[PDB]
Amino acid sequence: DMKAMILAAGRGERMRPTTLHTPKPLIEAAGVPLIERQLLALRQAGVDDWVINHAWLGEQIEAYLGDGSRLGGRIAYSPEGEPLETGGGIFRALPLLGEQPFLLLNGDVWSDFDYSRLHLADGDLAHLVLVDNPAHHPAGDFHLDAGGRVGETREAGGNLTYSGIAVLHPALFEGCQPGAFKLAPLLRKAIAAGRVSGEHHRGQWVDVGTHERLAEVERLLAEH
Amino acid sequence: DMKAMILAAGRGERMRPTTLHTPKPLIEAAGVPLIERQLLALRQAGVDDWVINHAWLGEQIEAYLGDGSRLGGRIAYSPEGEPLETGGGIFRALPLLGEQPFLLLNGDVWSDFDYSRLHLADGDLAHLVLVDNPAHHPAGDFHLDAGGRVGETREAGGNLTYSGIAVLHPALFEGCQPGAFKLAPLLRKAIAAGRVSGEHHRGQWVDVGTHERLAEVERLLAEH
Amino acid sequence: DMKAMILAAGRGERMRPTTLHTPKPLIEAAGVPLIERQLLALRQAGVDDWVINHAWLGEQIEAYLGDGSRLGGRIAYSPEGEPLETGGGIFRALPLLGEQPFLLLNGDVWSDFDYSRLHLADGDLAHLVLVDNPAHHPAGDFHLDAGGRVGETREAGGNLTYSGIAVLHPALFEGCQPGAFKLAPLLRKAIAAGRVSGEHHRGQWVDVGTHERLAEVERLLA
What we know:
The PDB classes it as transferase. Chain A has 224 residues and is an alpha/beta fold. Chain A has helices spanning 18-21, 34-43, 58-65, 86-97, 184-192, 211-221, and strands at residues 4-7, 28-29, 32-33, 49-54, 74-79, 102-106, 109-111, 126-131, 142-144, 150-152, 159-168, 196-201, 205-207.
């Protein structure tokens, strides 16, 4: 019954010339477009109610995915003229999502994470999946303590990278204005107020932002 | 008085079909063969004593460069039947280089680095130029510490990519055997013994492995 | 009055990585985008009715030039999603050009040619401006006979290069199919049929296909 939102609509400028032709969620990985892999992973978690925003070559996405029935779910689309940010894109799509907490997955993300574990405790505004810091961003985004509480980064020991996977409560967006803005300052505001839980994903995860990262994904899919 | 070695770098498979009829060193960058530009970059650094090994279509390299007089220096060739590796290529050529530390420049590298600043302190076996990690190799190869000391990579960051530019001591090859082998294991052993310095090059550098990256060299060569 | 077709949908693969983020027409030459310099050169000639095609990042070309009036003219856009080539881009734009002969300006080309002297004699299908063979193309393309007629390459003499500037008649494109194709097979047929005049421009001309040839245009504006 929980909905999922795939945050697409990024240009993929670091992935040109490919993304001159096709938007990044439609890039094939091991023969299957990334976003299709994402939606089938949500499907085997029990989540078949999907909201997808797009801006860059977005008509290709709707034409490839249809209404989702081909993959056994329902897709409601949030078309953007100009790109909203990680946060503006979600805020614009809030009417499609409703009042309940929803799953958030960034279009750029591949993982083997068990989406069915995701759960937002009553009182929290956000639950974040965190990963080991990748070599290209070794500093981390957030600290995660033993009680699974997300804080701002500490001097050293405990800092992890936001994976792009979360459960978000709509109230996180109270007072927001219709436009482009990033998700992170809203999470930092909920973090300052102590209302963000998190977990450390220890299995595989790739931010598919470059050709090299796409290769790492396709090497991981070619294991078993 | 210091000699320089332009090190072969391979058959240029990623740059077919061009490398079927023209080896990589002779592929033109803005109308001048890449290897000619490297020799002239060394010449403006005061280094006109050059050693060049070749394996793929090496008869064309000798034919174009000759003995180096046309460029103001002298060339000794180290022809190879079958390719030696980055390490074995140098080792095979060590008699041409003789006793003193020598400059090493990987034959598929272009940079704006000031080669004349290269210097190997006594007791060290190698001095390495390191660059920012490029998109196609984002984890880098070595850590550089505050004192200019090269180490293995550290998860906390500050890791840098080996540029293919260095000064090496012939004793770095103590005990080596004729054959093909890579340079990295010799560097790892000298690093472990604490005998490798390095510096961070903050200027331009391109690993010319594709035509797309050749175009980026040409953008650099045309600046102003 | 004569319309102009500016071919601005080129791939610009040789000028990567720049052309991954900015289409080549928008790349600056001594402070001014190349297509702006071409359109103002056309305006100086009294040619102010412009048709422009675009492909990759073509949206950036409409966002910069708009309706054309800030450069003294009017623009009709021929949006191609994926690049048709020289021949295909013109053919797709023919509805916007109409029935009359039209000025053709390739987007790669910088020159100080006097566009006002372009004419198409009745009967002819094309009038081509030819230049000296440049260093990156030393073999050349065609041959200019004393009557201002263009002819097929002679192992005897007169090799000149097509400069990307021309007047074209729409009937050149008859029997053509929607698709990507180069103009030169068409021109080669029209040259063999004796239906192509030309002239030999002796002023400056640079085919801006590489970063160095862009550098060359900036030295000239200087």
